[PDB]
Write an enzyme that holds these catalytic residues in place. Structure first.
Site, PDB file in Angstrom:
ATOM      1  N   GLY A  45       0.749  -1.421   0.077  1.00 37.71           N
ATOM      2  CA  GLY A  45      -0.058   0.029   0.060  1.00 37.71           C
ATOM      3  C   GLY A  45       0.679   1.184  -0.098  1.00 37.71           C
ATOM      4  N   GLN A  50       2.541  10.188   1.594  1.00 35.33           N
ATOM      5  CA  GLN A  50       3.804   9.682   1.605  1.00 35.33           C
ATOM      6  C   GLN A  50       4.911  10.052   0.373  1.00 35.33           C
ATOM      7  OE1 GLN A  50       2.296   5.377   2.289  1.00 35.33           O
ATOM      8  NE2 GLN A  50       4.309   5.536   3.423  1.00 35.33           N
ATOM      9  N   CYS A  90       6.093  -0.108   7.475  1.00 34.88           N
ATOM     10  CA  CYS A  90       5.719   1.210   6.543  1.00 34.88           C
ATOM     11  C   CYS A  90       7.082   1.440   5.993  1.00 34.88           C
ATOM     12  CB  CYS A  90       5.347   1.990   7.706  1.00 34.88           C
ATOM     13  SG  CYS A  90       4.912   3.687   6.915  1.00 34.88           S
ATOM     14  N   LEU A  91       6.624   1.846   4.678  1.00 34.18           N
ATOM     15  CA  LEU A  91       7.524   2.435   3.869  1.00 34.18           C
ATOM     16  C   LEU A  91       8.321   3.515   4.096  1.00 34.18           C
ATOM     17  CD1 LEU A  91       5.917   1.592  -0.016  1.00 34.18           C
ATOM     18  CD2 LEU A  91       7.560   0.095   1.634  1.00 34.18           C
ATOM     19  N   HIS A 132      -4.428   1.587   7.501  1.00 37.22           N
ATOM     20  CA  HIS A 132      -2.995   1.833   7.913  1.00 37.22           C
ATOM     21  C   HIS A 132      -2.886   2.988   6.836  1.00 37.22           C
ATOM     22  CE1 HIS A 132       1.547   1.160   7.952  1.00 37.22           C
ATOM     23  NE2 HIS A 132       1.504   1.968   6.794  1.00 37.22           N
ATOM     24  N   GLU A 133      -3.264   2.854   5.668  1.00 35.55           N
ATOM     25  CA  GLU A 133      -3.146   3.719   4.605  1.00 35.55           C
ATOM     26  C   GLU A 133      -4.234   5.186   4.851  1.00 35.55           C
ATOM     27  OE1 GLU A 133      -0.627   3.579   2.769  1.00 35.55           O
ATOM     28  OE2 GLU A 133      -0.352   1.514   2.847  1.00 35.55           O
ATOM     29  N   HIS A 136      -2.319   7.424   7.159  1.00 33.51           N
ATOM     30  CA  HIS A 136      -1.492   8.284   6.296  1.00 33.51           C
ATOM     31  C   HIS A 136      -2.033   9.502   6.065  1.00 33.51           C
ATOM     32  CE1 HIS A 136       2.480   6.280   6.495  1.00 33.51           C
ATOM     33  NE2 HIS A 136       1.969   4.973   5.893  1.00 33.51           N
TER      34      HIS A 136
HETATM   35 CO    CO Z   1       2.860   3.180   6.075  1.00 34.88          CO
HETATM   36  S   H2S Z   2       3.260   2.530   3.811  1.00 33.08           S
END
Ligand code: CO
Ligand code: H2S
EC number: 3.5.1.88
Length: 163
Positions: A45, A50, A90-91, A132-133, A136
């Site tokens: 995702g 982000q 998480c990225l 989660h997304e 963000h």
């Molecule tokens: Co994330």
């Molecule tokens: S992420």
């Protein structure tokens, strides 16, 4: 093209995204770049926030073969139920994972890449990724559910990683 993903500690990660006004060619470009970026990072995702784009756009693909593209533009949580959690990554918080409380099931409404409204009832991993997304897009990160000390150790380790 592949976009740059912001990492903690970057205050733009805390920005609240504006709704998308119309799903035009430019929105669709962002969507496509988002998938390209997500896949290149081996993610499931990505939220526009982000990649420093402050619009309510999320891309998801929880499939192994990377062929189940889910686009959530202006997503709206209609209902949720149950509780669950897994060790999330998480990225924007590289190499750090932690269990976080989440709803087990969610029902959402969103626009797809053509601007068409749809509804989705999700459970399991997909429900968790959705939450989660969506977090963000309101400047919330998974580490925000952890103790102030966990947050510190996580802050300290990412900062040393991005050396
Ligand atoms: Co994330
Ligand atoms: S992420």
């Amino acid at each position: 093209s592949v976009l740059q993903v912001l990492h903690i500690p970057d205050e733009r990660l805390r920005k609240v995204a504006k709704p998308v006004e119309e799903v035009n060619a430019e929105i669709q470009r962002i969507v496509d770049d988002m998938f390209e970026t997500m896949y290149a990072e081996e993610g499931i995702g990505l939220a526009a926030t982000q990649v420093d784009i402050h619009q309510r756009i999320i891309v998801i693909d929880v499939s192994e073969n990377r062929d189940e593209r889910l686009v959530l533009i202006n997503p709206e949580l209609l209902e949720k139920s149950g509780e669950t959690g897994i060790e999330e990554g998480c990225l924007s918080i590289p190499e750090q994972r932690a269990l976080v409380p989440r709803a087990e099931k969610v029902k959402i409404r969103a626009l797809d890449r053509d601007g068409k409204p749809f509804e989705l009832e999700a459970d399991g991993l997909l429900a968790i990724c959705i939450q989660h997304e969506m977090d963000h897009l309101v400047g919330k990160l998974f580490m925000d559910y952890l103790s102030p000390l966990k947050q510190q150790r996580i802050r300290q380790k990412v900062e040393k990683l991005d050396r």
